[PDB]
Design an enzyme around this catalytic site. Structure first.
Site, mmCIF file in Angstrom:
data_model
loop_
_atom_site.group_PDB
_atom_site.id
_atom_site.type_symbol
_atom_site.label_atom_id
_atom_site.label_comp_id
_atom_site.label_asym_id
_atom_site.label_seq_id
_atom_site.Cartn_x
_atom_site.Cartn_y
_atom_site.Cartn_z
ATOM 1 N N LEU A 1 0.796 -1.232 0.000
ATOM 2 C CA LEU A 1 0.000 0.000 0.000
ATOM 3 C C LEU A 1 0.834 1.292 0.000
ATOM 4 O O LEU A 1 0.306 2.356 -0.335
ATOM 5 C CB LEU A 1 -1.003 -0.009 1.166
ATOM 6 C CG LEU A 1 -2.057 -1.121 1.155
ATOM 7 C CD1 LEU A 1 -2.553 -1.404 2.551
ATOM 8 C CD2 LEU A 1 -3.224 -0.781 0.238
ATOM 9 N N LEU B 1 0.190 7.701 19.198
ATOM 10 C CA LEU B 1 1.471 7.527 18.503
ATOM 11 C C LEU B 1 2.377 8.770 18.497
ATOM 12 O O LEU B 1 3.569 8.643 18.206
ATOM 13 C CB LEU B 1 1.229 7.019 17.067
ATOM 14 C CG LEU B 1 1.383 5.508 16.819
ATOM 15 C CD1 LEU B 1 0.366 4.685 17.610
ATOM 16 C CD2 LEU B 1 1.236 5.188 15.347
ATOM 17 N N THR C 1 4.815 3.289 1.754
ATOM 18 C CA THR C 1 5.613 3.582 2.948
ATOM 19 C C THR C 1 5.126 4.879 3.603
ATOM 20 O O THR C 1 5.047 5.918 2.943
ATOM 21 C CB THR C 1 7.118 3.616 2.607
ATOM 22 O OG1 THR C 1 7.471 2.444 1.867
ATOM 23 C CG2 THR C 1 8.006 3.731 3.847
ATOM 24 N N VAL D 1 6.287 0.475 6.702
ATOM 25 C CA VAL D 1 5.620 0.193 5.422
ATOM 26 C C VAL D 1 4.305 -0.552 5.685
ATOM 27 O O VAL D 1 4.264 -1.435 6.545
ATOM 28 C CB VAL D 1 6.537 -0.600 4.440
ATOM 29 C CG1 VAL D 1 5.955 -0.626 3.028
ATOM 30 C CG2 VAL D 1 7.957 -0.038 4.418
ATOM 31 N N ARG E 1 -4.225 13.382 7.827
ATOM 32 C CA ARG E 1 -3.028 12.553 7.671
ATOM 33 C C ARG E 1 -3.120 11.263 8.490
ATOM 34 O O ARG E 1 -2.624 10.224 8.055
ATOM 35 C CB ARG E 1 -1.759 13.338 8.071
ATOM 36 C CG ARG E 1 -1.902 14.868 8.096
ATOM 37 C CD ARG E 1 -0.600 15.576 8.428
ATOM 38 N NE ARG E 1 -0.027 15.135 9.703
ATOM 39 C CZ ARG E 1 -0.172 15.773 10.860
ATOM 40 N NH1 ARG E 1 -0.867 16.902 10.922
ATOM 41 N NH2 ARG E 1 0.388 15.296 11.960
ATOM 42 N N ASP F 1 -3.584 5.978 14.135
ATOM 43 C CA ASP F 1 -2.316 6.542 14.627
ATOM 44 C C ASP F 1 -2.494 7.364 15.929
ATOM 45 O O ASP F 1 -1.751 8.321 16.179
ATOM 46 C CB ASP F 1 -1.587 7.336 13.517
ATOM 47 C CG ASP F 1 -1.249 6.507 12.290
ATOM 48 O OD1 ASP F 1 -0.240 5.766 12.331
ATOM 49 O OD2 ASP F 1 -1.990 6.601 11.288
#
Ligand code: ZN
Lengths: 254, 92
Positions: free
Chosen positions: A16, A150, A18, A23, A133, A147
């Site tokens: 998909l 994170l 990096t 990745v 994002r 995410d």
């Protein structure tokens, strides 16, 4: 442990691309269930920090959240198996005008993010970095959040940061509210950069001086008032995701 | 190999289009001949060989031209219309 997955059952299919931490590869676990495999690059994130990151993301589940299916620790690199979102990043999904999005469709995306953010609000969980994002879209068009947390592991999201996070670095539940407001702008401006004409250093200074993001051509006065309420100088006067979803659903039936 | 065991035959593929919408400007006979079967949601059709999902069916569409443009590696597609056709559709 108890969340560890045997990679012997996994079958890789399409890389998909990096991104951050590593990745992402699309695969099929047990030959029928669609999975997204995040391959954490050797030494990208802190090994001790990967303990708290996984544990907090495990015991958390929502209709509008990217569900973590588990980990693969007994080999290098460490794998993160999650819910496969066909369309990928929301930012790229918006930037592609080959969809011809309607005002009603963009408002439905805001509902999806808000529904998920209200769940993190109840769990006292801070995203610490909410933007397009860090948002994913599945084949059906449903926007989910990923995410999360994170930000405290492994340039800075200045344009999504409220004045207290800029001048004093104080993170609250209202800090994600401001970030959601900038994300609401990202959706209605169709992946456009917030404060494009100003650099990251100028953005921090201008936000403190009272500059707020303009109404995009797509958003109506009502929807702009929803994203503007998020941008209150005093965090105490910013709404909650319960109040925000209420206004989103009210304007949806208007 | 095959993706869906139940939809190997045209007669079996046609049985899914029982509650297919009479609004869509694509005939089920065309879809079922192209290895497609109705999933059950609005206009979602999957392939029995490649599991190729296709939706948002517009007028002036050919289920074979859509099968080659989106899934050229489909073993049934190359078997039915031929590689010469598949390469011509993918060539644009
Ligand atoms: Zn096929």
């Amino acid at each position: 442990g108890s969340w560890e997955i045997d990679p012997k059952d996994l079958t890789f299919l399409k890389e998909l691309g990096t991104g951050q931490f590593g990745v992402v590869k699309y695969g099929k676990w047990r030959g029928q269930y669609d999975v997204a495999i995040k391959m954490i690059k050797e030494g990208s994130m802190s090994e001790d920090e990967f303990i708290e990151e996984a544990k907090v993301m495990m015991n958390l589940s929502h209709e509008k959240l990217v569900q973590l299916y588990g980990v693969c620790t007994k080999q290098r690199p460490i794998f993160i198996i999650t819910e496969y979102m066909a369309n990928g990043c929301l930012l790229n999904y918006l930037r592609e005008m080959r969809h011809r999005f309607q005002t009603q469709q963009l408002l439905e995306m805001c509902k999806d993010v808000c529904e998920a953010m209200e769940y993190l609000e109840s769990k006292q969980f801070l995203h610490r970095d909410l933007a397009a994002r860090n948002c994913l879209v599945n084949d059906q068009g449903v926007v989910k959040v990923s995410d999360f947390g994170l930000s405290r592991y492994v340039k800075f999201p200045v344009r999504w940061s409220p004045p207290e996070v800029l001048m004093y670095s104080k993170f609250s539940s209202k800090s994600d509210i401001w970030a959601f407001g900038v994300l609401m702008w990202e959706i209605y401006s169709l992946g456009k950069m917030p404060y494009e004409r100003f650099t990251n250093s100028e953005t921090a200074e201008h936000i403190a001086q009272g500059l707020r993001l303009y109404r995009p051509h797509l958003a109506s006065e009502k929807v702009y008032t929803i994203m503007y309420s998020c941008w209150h100088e005093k965090a105490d006067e910013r709404p909650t995701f319960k109040i925000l979803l209420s206004n989103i659903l009210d304007v949806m039936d208007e | 190999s095959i993706s869906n065991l139940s939809m190997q035959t045209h007669a079996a593929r046609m049985r899914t289009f029982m509650y297919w919408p009479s609004s869509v400007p694509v005939q089920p006979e065309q879809l079922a001949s192209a290895g497609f079967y109705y999933v059950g949601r609005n206009d979602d059709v999957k392939c029995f060989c490649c599991d190729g999902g296709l939706r948002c069916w517009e007028s002036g569409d050919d289920p074979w031209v859509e099968h080659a443009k989106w899934f050229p590696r489909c073993e049934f597609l190359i078997r039915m219309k031929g590689q010469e056709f598949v390469d011509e559709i993918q060539g644009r």
